[PDB]
Amino acid sequence: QTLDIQRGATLFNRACIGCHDTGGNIIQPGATLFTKDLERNGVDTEEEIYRVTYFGKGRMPGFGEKCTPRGQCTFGPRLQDEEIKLLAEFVKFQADQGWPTV
Amino acid sequence: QTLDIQRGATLFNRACIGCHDTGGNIIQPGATLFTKDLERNGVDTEEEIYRVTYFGKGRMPGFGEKCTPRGQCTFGPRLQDEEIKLLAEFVKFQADQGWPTV
Amino acid sequence: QTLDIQRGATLFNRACIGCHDTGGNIIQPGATLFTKDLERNGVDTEEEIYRVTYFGKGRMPGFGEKCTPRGQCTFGPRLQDEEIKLLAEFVKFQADQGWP
Amino acid sequence: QTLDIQRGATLFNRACIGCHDTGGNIIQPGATLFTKDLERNGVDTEEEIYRVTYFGKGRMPGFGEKCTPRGQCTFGPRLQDEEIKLLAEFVKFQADQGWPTV
Ligand code: HEM
Ligand code: HEM
Ligand code: HEM
Ligand code: HEM
Ligand SMILES: [Zn+2]
Ligand SMILES: [Zn+2]
C-alpha cells in the first residue's frame, strides 16, 4: 500500500469508523461507502466525497474548518484540508477495491 | 481510480516513458518497475522510489531540483518535489497492482 | 517570497500574462484580477478562482485536464491540478496586494 | 489571505505559538521568526526553515516523523511532511511581510 492510503486508513479509524465501519452506514440504509450506494446518492466523484466530508450531508457531520453551523459539524476537532483530501482519496480507493480490510 | 493516480499517470507519461513504458525497463534487465524487481533491487518503498527518481541511479538520470552532479541528472526540465512525490506514489501503486492501464 | 509564490509567478508569466498583464484584462472590461472586479463577478474566493482557471468562463479559456469542450479550453498543453492550485493562490495573493 | 496561509496559521497555533507567539521566541534572545534574526542565524530560506522545524536546532525540538536522534526531537505528537511544508511557508511568508496580523 502507499503512504497516502496508510495515512487515509489511520484518519478513517480515528474519525469515521463510528458510523462507517467496514464501509457500511449504521444510520442510513443505502448510503454506505460502497460504489453502488455512492453512485445512487450522487457522491461517486472524489471531489464530492471531499465536499460531503468537509461540509456534511444530512445527518452526517462535516469535519472541515469552515463547516457551519456548528450543529451540522463534528463535535470533535476539525480536520485539516489535507486530512480531508486523504480521507476522500481513501474512500474512493476503498470503494474502487470493494472495501478490503483497513 | 483516484485523482492522485490520474495525476501521477500524466507525469509518468511525460517524464518516464522513455525507459519505463508499461512498467518495464528498456535500458537493462532485472530493473523494471514490477514488484519482483523493485524488491530485488531494494527500491520497494516510496521513500526509496522518491530517492531514485530525485537523485538518479546508475544509468537512470535524476529529476530532482538539487540533483547533482549535472552529469547524473536530466538535461530536460527538472521536476518539482510534489511531482516526484506523485510519481513515487504512482510507481508504488502500479507495482502493487501489477501495472494495469490507467 | 515563498516557493509557492515564485512558482505561481513562473506559471502566470507563461500562461496568463498575455491577457492579464499586471492583473488587468485585455479582453473584458470590469473583469480584471483586482479585488473589486473579482467580487463583482462572483470569483471572490480562491476556490472560485481555481474553478474559473480550470474550467474557463466565456472568453476565459480553461486550463484543467478535464476542461470541456475543446473550444472552451486553452489551445496549449493542459496544466496540472497543482499548477492551477498555485495559480489560484498567486492570483488571490496578488489581488490582496493590489498587483504591485 | 490565501488558503495556504490560513492552513499554516492553524498548524502554527497548535504546535509553535507556545514558544513563538507573535513571531517571537520566549526561550532565548536573538532567535525570533523575524527576517533580521532568521538572516543572522542562517535560517532565512524556506528549505532551512523546513529543516529546523523537522530536525530541530539547539534548544528547539524537531517535529518531523523521522527526526533523529530521539533527544533532539519532540516527545509529543509529530507532524506530517505536508504540515511542516505549510509551516515553513507560513514562517517564510510572515517573516517576509513583517508579521502582519492573521
Ligand atoms: C470520516 C471523516 C467520514 C467520512 C470520510 C465519511 C464519508 C461519507 C460519504 C462519502 C458519504 C456518502 C455515502 C453515500 O453512499 O452516499 C457519507 C454519508 C453519511 N455519513 Fe459519513 N463519513 C464520515 C464520518 C461519519 C460519521 C462519524 C457519521 C456518524 C455520526 C457519519 C454518518 C453518515 C450518514 C448518516 C451519511 C448519509 C448521508 C445521507 O445521504 O443522508 N459519517 N459519509
Ligand atoms: C520518471 C521520472 C522515472 C521514474 C519514476 C523512474 C523510476 C525508477 C524506479 C522506481 C527504479 C527502480 C527499479 C528497480 O527495479 O530497481 C528505476 C530504475 C531504473 N531506471 Fe528509472 N525512472 C524514471 C525515468 C527513467 C528514464 C527516463 C530512464 C532511461 C534513461 C530510466 C532508466 C532506469 C534504469 C537504467 C534503472 C536501473 C538503475 C539501477 O538499479 O542501476 N529511468 N527507475
Ligand atoms: C492563467 C492560467 C490565467 C489565470 C490564472 C486566469 C484567471 C482569471 C480569473 C480569476 C478571472 C476572473 C476575473 C474576474 O474579475 O471575474 C479571469 C477572467 C477572464 N480571463 Fe483569465 N486567466 C488566465 C488566462 C487567461 C488568458 C490566457 C486569457 C486570454 C486569452 C484570459 C482571458 C480572460 C477573460 C476574457 C476573462 C473574463 C471572463 C468573464 O467574466 O466573462 N485569461 N481569468
Ligand atoms: C512549530 C512547529 C515551530 C516552528 C515552525 C518553529 C520554527 C523555528 C524557526 C524557523 C527557528 C529559527 C529562528 C531564527 O531566528 O533563527 C526556530 C528557532 C527556535 N525555536 Fe522554534 N519552531 C517551532 C516550535 C518551537 C517550540 C514549541 C519551541 C519552544 C519549546 C521552540 C523554540 C525554539 C528555540 C529555542 C529556537 C532557537 C534555535 C537556535 O537557533 O539555537 N520552537 N524555530
Ligand atoms: Zn495520494
Ligand atoms: Zn502555498
Q: Which amino acid, D20?
A: H
What is the four-CA torsion angle of C72, C77, C83, C89, rounded to 10 degrees? -40
Ligand 3 first shell, C-beta below 6 A: C 15-16, 18-20, 25, 27-28, 31-33, 37-38, 41, 43, 49, 52-53, 57-61, 63, 87, 91
C-alpha cell at C56: 474557463
| CA pair distance D18, B67, nearest whole angstrom | 37
φ and ψ of D74, to 5 deg = -65, 150
Whether there are 3 or more C-beta pairs closer than 8 Å between D and A is yes
Question: Which residues from B are below 8 Å from C when comparing CB atoms?
Answer: 3, 6-7, 10-11, 80, 82-83
Beta bridge partners of A62: A73
What's this structure's resolution in Å?
1.5
Q: Which positions in chain A have a beta carbon within 8 angstroms of at least one beta carbon in chain B? A: 1-4, 46-47, 89, 92-93, 96
Residue C78 burial (10 A CB sphere; 0-12, 13-18, 19+): middle
The answer to whether D16 touches D10, Cβ cutoff 8 Å, is no
Q: What's the rounded Cα separation, in Å, for the pair D85 and D67?
A: 15
Instruction: Return the half-sphere exposure (C-beta side, CA atoms, 13 A cut-off) of residue C70.
Output: 2
Calculate how far, in angstroms, residue A9's C-alpha sits from the geometric centre of ligand 5: 12
Query: Which amino acids of B are annotated as binding site, given as ranges?
Result: 16, 19-20, 28-32, 60
Q: How many CB atoms lie within 10 A of CB D12?
A: 20
Residue C77 β-bridge partners: none
Residues ending a continuous segment of chain C before a break (C–N > 2.5 Å) = none
Experimental technique used to determine this entry: X-ray
A57: phi then psi, degrees, rounded to nearest 5: -165, 125
Cα of A1 vs centre of ligand 2, distance in Å, is 20
The domains of chain D are located at 1-102
Of B94, C35, B56, A39, which is closest to residue D1 (Cα–Cα)? C35
Find where cell 520566549 sits. D26
Residue B60 φ then ψ, to 5°: -95, 125
Please name the residue of chain D whose CA is at the shortest distance from the CA of residue C35: D1
Query: Residue B101, CB half-sphere, CA atoms under 13 Å: how many?
Result: 0
How far apart, in whole angstroms, are the C-alpha atoms of residue D68 and residue D33?
A: 23
Looking at residue D87, what DSSP letter applies? Answer: H
Tell me whether strands D56-57 and D60-61 are parallel, antiparallel or unpaired: antiparallel
- Asked if residue A31 belongs to a known ligand binding site, the reply is yes
Longest Cα pair distance anywhere in chain C, in angstroms? 37
Burial class (CB in 10 A: 0-12, 13-18, 19+), A75: exposed
Say which CATH superfamily domain C1-100 falls into. Answer: Cytochrome c-like domain (1.10.760.10)
* Residue type, position C45, single letter: T
Q: Is the CB of B46 less than 8 angstroms away from the CB of A2?
A: yes
The C-alpha atoms of residue A101 and residue A94 are separated, in whole angstroms, by 9
Give the H or E element holding residue B97.
helix B81-97
Indicate the annotated binding residues of B for heme: 28-32
Distance, in Å, from the CA atom of A16 to the CA atom of A8, rounded to the nearest integer, reads 11
* 3-state secondary structure (DSSP) of residue D74: coil
Gap between the Cα atoms of A58 and A55, Å rounded:
10
Nearest ligand for residue D61 CA: 4
Q: Where are the alpha helices (DSSP H) in chain B?
A: 3-15, 17-20, 35-41, 46-55, 81-97
**Which atom of ligand 2 lies closest to the CA of B18?**
27
Exposed, middle or buried, A29 (CB in 10 Å: 0-12/13-18/19+)?
Answer: exposed
* Look-up of cell digits 472541515: A64
Three-state SS for D6-70 is HHHHHHHHHHCHHHHHHHCCCCCCCCCCCHHHHHHCCCCCHHHHHHHHHHEECCEEECECCCCCH
Return d(Cα B91, Cα B97) in angstroms, integer.
10
Q: Give start and end residues of each alpha helix (H) in chain C.
A: 3-15, 17-20, 35-40, 46-55, 81-97
Beta bridge partners of B33: none
Measured CA to CA, the distance from residue D84 to residue D94 in angstroms comes to 15
> Cis before residue B100, ω within 30 degrees of 0?
no
Neighbour count for residue B27 (Cβ, 10 Å): 12
D57 forms beta bridges with D60
Tell me the three state secondary structure of residue B52: helix
Is D1-102 CATH 1.10.760.10?
yes
Omega of the bond prior to C69 within 30 degrees of 0, cis?
yes
* Gap between the Cα atoms of C66 and C56, Å rounded: 11
Asked if A18 and A12 count as a contact pair (C-beta separation under 8 A), the reply is: no
**Cα–Cα dist C52/B82, whole Å:** 23
Facing C65 at nearest CB: one of B10, B80, B82? B10
The three cell numbers of residue A81 are 484540508
